[PDB]
C-alpha cells in the first residue's frame, strides 16, 4: 500500500520545489502514474482477502473507492487550472498540496482496518475541505457553509468515538474480521439501542438524510469545482463504507432500528427529487439529486441483504463519477458567464455542438438509462426493498419518474432552447475540459462492460 | 414585429382586429373559398350597418357583445399560419439562426478560406465604431427632460451619418 501512498507523499515536495512552468504537468502526469499503479489490488485471484499488516488492508468494497479517488485527484487538478490563474504560484501550490493530502487521507482510511484509525482520518478529511471552501470560493456565505460542514461532521464524530471506546473495552480489540470472528448478540435494551445510534449517527449525518441534507447545497454551491467533486464523490462514501464495515456487530438491532431511517430516507429522496424540478441554482439541483440517490444507498445499506449491498456499491460508484462530471460541466458554463443560474444561459448546442453529448451522456446515466451500473444498482436495490416489503416500489417509481423529469428539464433549459444574444463571452470549449468529460465518462463504459470488479462483498 | 405598439388602443383598431379574427375563423369554418367570400360579404354588411354611428355607448355595447358572440362561436381548432405562432414552422430554423459574433472566435486556418467575406467585416464594424458616439448625443441631446417617451427611435437628422441603434436590427440573420 506504501507503493500507492509514498509517491502521493512525494508529489508534495515535488510541487513545492518544482518551477512554475512545469509543476502542473509534472504533478499531473505523476498522479496519473499513481492511479495506474493503484490497480495491483485487483489481482484478487481467490477469496482470501488482502492483508498487508496490522495497520492496512484492502477488500472488494474498498478497492473501487481507492482507485476512484486516485483517479479523481488529477481531474480536480485539471479542472482547477483556469481559475486561480491570476493567483500566485505559492497559493496554487497550497491548493495542490491540500488536494493531495485529501487523496492520501482517503486512501489510508478506505484501506485501514482499525476503525479508530479510520475515524481519525475520517475527521482529518475536514481541514483541507474547509480551507479549499473558504479560501477559494466566489461568494460570502461560504463561511457559514464551512461552519455547518465542520460542526455537523464533528457532532457525528463524537459519539462514534465514545462507542468505539466502549467496544475496545468490552471486546478486546477493534481490528476488523476479528470483530467478525468474535462478534456476539446483545440483550436488545435501551443501552445497546443508544449504542447503535452513537455508532451510525455520524455516518448518517455525513451521508445526508432528509433531516440533515442542509450542509450539502451550501458546500457544493459556495465551494469550487474540486471541493464539489470530492464531496459528491467520496466524502459521502466514507459514511457508507464505515456503516458497512461496522454494522457487522450490531445484529439484530438493525431490524427495528431502521424503520425511522428508511422512512426518512425514502420520503427525503422523494421531496428532494421534487425540489430538483424547481431549484434554480444548477449546482443545488445536482446536490439534491445526490441526496436522492444516497437515500437509496442508505435504505439498501440498513436492511442488510447481499443484492442490496452490491446495488449500493454500484450506484455509489456511478453517482460519484456522474456527479463529478455534471459539476465539471456546470463550472465550465460558469467560467464563461459567472452566474450559476439555469435560466440565464439558454439555447446552447448551436455553439457547443459537442459538449452537449457530454451533457446528454450524464443525464442518461442519472435517470438510470441502461446498460449502466446506475440502473443495475437502482434495480437490485429496488429488488431488495420489494422483498423487504411490497409497498416500496411505489416510492422507487415516484423517484424514477421525477428524475426522468428533472434531468431532461436541466438538459432543456441549457441545451435545447434558442441562443441568447448578449453572451459574447462564450469562449469555445477547451481541450482540457473536453478531456475531463471524456475521462469521467469512459470508465462508465468499461465498467458497464465488466462490472464483476464493482460488485461488492457478496460477489 | 419590428415597430412597437402604443399603451392604449382605440375603438378603430379594436374593431379592425375583431374583423380580421372573425374572418379568419370563418375561412376556417367554411372551407370553400366561395362560401368564405359569401359570409365575409355578409359580415362586411353587418359592420357597414352600424359603421356611421359614433356614440361611445353603442360602440362599447356592440363591441362587448361582438366579442362574446365571437368567443362563443369561434373555431376550436383555428387556421394557424405556419410561419407565425401556433404553426408548424415557428422557430423551426432558430436552431440554425446563429448570430454573427460567433465569427470572431473562428480559427485563422478556417477563415483562411472564405477570405473575401472577412475582408468586408472589418469595413462594416469600421462603419460602426466611427459612428457610434454620435448616435448617443442624438438622444442625450433629444432625451426630452419631460420624461414621457415611447419605444420609437429617431433617424439621423444629419446626412452622411448613420441612424441610431442599427446593430440589433441589421445583421439579424435570414429566415431561410
Amino acid at each position: 500500500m506504501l507503493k500507492i501512498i509514498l509517491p502521493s507523499l512525494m508529489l508534495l515536495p515535488l510541487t513545492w520545489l518544482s518551477s512554475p512552468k512545469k509543476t502542473w504537468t509534472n504533478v499531473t502526469s505523476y498522479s496519473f502514474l499513481i492511479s495506474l499503479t493503484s490497480l495491483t489490488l485487483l489481482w484478487q485471484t481467490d477469496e482470501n482477502y488482502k492483508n498487508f499488516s496490522n495497520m492496512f488492508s484492502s477488500d472488494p468494497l474498498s478497492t473501487p473507492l481507492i482507485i476512484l479517488t486516485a483517479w479523481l485527484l488529477p481531474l480536480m487538478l485539471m479542472a482547477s487550472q483556469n481559475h486561480l490563474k491570476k493567483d500566485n504560484n505559492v497559493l496554487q501550490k497550497l491548493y495542490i498540496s491540500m488536494l493531495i493530502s485529501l487523496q492520501i487521507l482517503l486512501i489510508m482510511t478506505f484501506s485501514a482496518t482499525e476503525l479508530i484509525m479510520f475515524y481519525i482520518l475520517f475527521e482529518a478529511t475536514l481541514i483541507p475541505t474547509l480551507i479549499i471552501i473558504t479560501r477559494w470560493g466566489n461568494q460570502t456565505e461560504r463561511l457559514n457553509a464551512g461552519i455547518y460542514f465542520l460542526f455537523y461532521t464533528l457532532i457525528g464524530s463524537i459519539p462514534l468515538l465514545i462507542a468505539l471506546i466502549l467496544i475496545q473495552n468490552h471486546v478486546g480489540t477493534l481490528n476488523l474480521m476479528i470483530l467478525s470472528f468474535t462478534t456476539h448478540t446483545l440483550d436488545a435494551s435501551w443501552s445497546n439501542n443508544l449504542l447503535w445510534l452513537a455508532c451510525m449517527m455520524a455516518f448518517l449525518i455525513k451521508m445526508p438524510l432528509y433531516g440533515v441534507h442542509l450542509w450539502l447545497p451550501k458546500a457544493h454551491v459556495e465551494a469550487p469545482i474540486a471541493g464539489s467533486m470530492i464531496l459528491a464523490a467520496i466524502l459521502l462514501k466514507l459514511g457508507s463504507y464505515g456503516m458497512i464495515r461496522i454494522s457487522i456487530i450490531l445484529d439484530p438491532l438493525t431490524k427495528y432500528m431502521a424503520y425511522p431511517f428508511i422512512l426518512l430516507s425514502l420520503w427525503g429522496m422523494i421531496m428532494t427529487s421534487s425540489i430538483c424540478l424547481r431549484q434554480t441554482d444548477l449546482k443545488s439541483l445536482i446536490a439534491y439529486s445526490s441526496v436522492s440517490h444516497m437515500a437509496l444507498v442508505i435504505a439498501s445499506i440498513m436492511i442488510q441483504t447481499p443484492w442490496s449491498f452490491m446495488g449500493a456499491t454500484m450506484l455509489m460508484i456511478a453517482h460519484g463519477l456522474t456527479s463529478s462530471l455534471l459539476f465539471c460541466l456546470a463550472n465550465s458554463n460558469y467560467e464563461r458567464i459567472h452566474s450559476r443560474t439555469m435560466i440565464m444561459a439558454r439555447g446552447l448546442q448551436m455553439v457547443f455542438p459537442l459538449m452537449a453529448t457530454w451533457w446528454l451522456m450524464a443525464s442518461l446515466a442519472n435517470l438510470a438509462l441502461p446498460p449502466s451500473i446506475n440502473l443495475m444498482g437502482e434495480l437490485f436495490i429496488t429488488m431488495s426493498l420489494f422483498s423487504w416489503s411490497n409497498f416500496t416500489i411505489i416510492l422507487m417509481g415516484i423517484n424514477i419518474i421525477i428524475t426522468g423529469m428533472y434531468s431532461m428539464y436541466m438538459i432543456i433549459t441549457t441545451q435545447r432552447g434558442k441562443l441568447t444574444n448578449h453572451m459574447i463571452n462564450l469562449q469555445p470549449s477547451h481541450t482540457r475540459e473536453l478531456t475531463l468529460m471524456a475521462l469521467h465518462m469512459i470508465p462508465l463504459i468499461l465498467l458497464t462492460t465488466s462490472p464483476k470488479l464493482i460488485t461488492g462483498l457478496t460477489m | 414585429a419590428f415597430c412597437a405598439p402604443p399603451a392604449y388602443l382605440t375603438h378603430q383598431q379594436k374593431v379592425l382586429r375583431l374583423y380580421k379574427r372573425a374572418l379568419r375563423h370563418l375561412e376556417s369554418w367554411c372551407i370553400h373559398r366561395d362560401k368564405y367570400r359569401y359570409f365575409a360579404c355578409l359580415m362586411r354588411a353587418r359592420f357597414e350597418e352600424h359603421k356611421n354611428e359614433k356614440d361611445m355607448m353603442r360602440a362599447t355595447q356592440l363591441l362587448r357583445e361582438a366579442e362574446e358572440e365571437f368567443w362563443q362561436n369561434q373555431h376550436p381548432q383555428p387556421y394557424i399560419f405556419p410561419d407565425s405562432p401556433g404553426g408548424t414552422s415557428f422557430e423551426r430554423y432558430e436552431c440554425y439562426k446563429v448570430p454573427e459574433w460567433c465569427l470572431d472566435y473562428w480559427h485563422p486556418s478556417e477563415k483562411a478560406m472564405y477570405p473575401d467575406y472577412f475582408s468586408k467585416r472589418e469595413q462594416w464594424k469600421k462603419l460602426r465604431m466611427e459612428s457610434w458616439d454620435r448616435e448617443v448625443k442624438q438622444l442625450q441631446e433629444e432625451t426630452s427632460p419631460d420624461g414621457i417617451m415611447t419605444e420609437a427611435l429617431p433617424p439621423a437628422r444629419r446626412e452622411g451619418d448613420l441612424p441610431p441603434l442599427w446593430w440589433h436590427i441589421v445583421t439579424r440573420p435570414r429566415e431561410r
Binding site: 448551436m350 469555445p428 | 472566435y105 467575406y117
Partner: peptide
Amino acid sequence: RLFVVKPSLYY
C-alpha cells in the same frame, strides 16, 4: 450561393 454563419468547430 450565400454564406452560412456558424461557430468555430476547430476546437
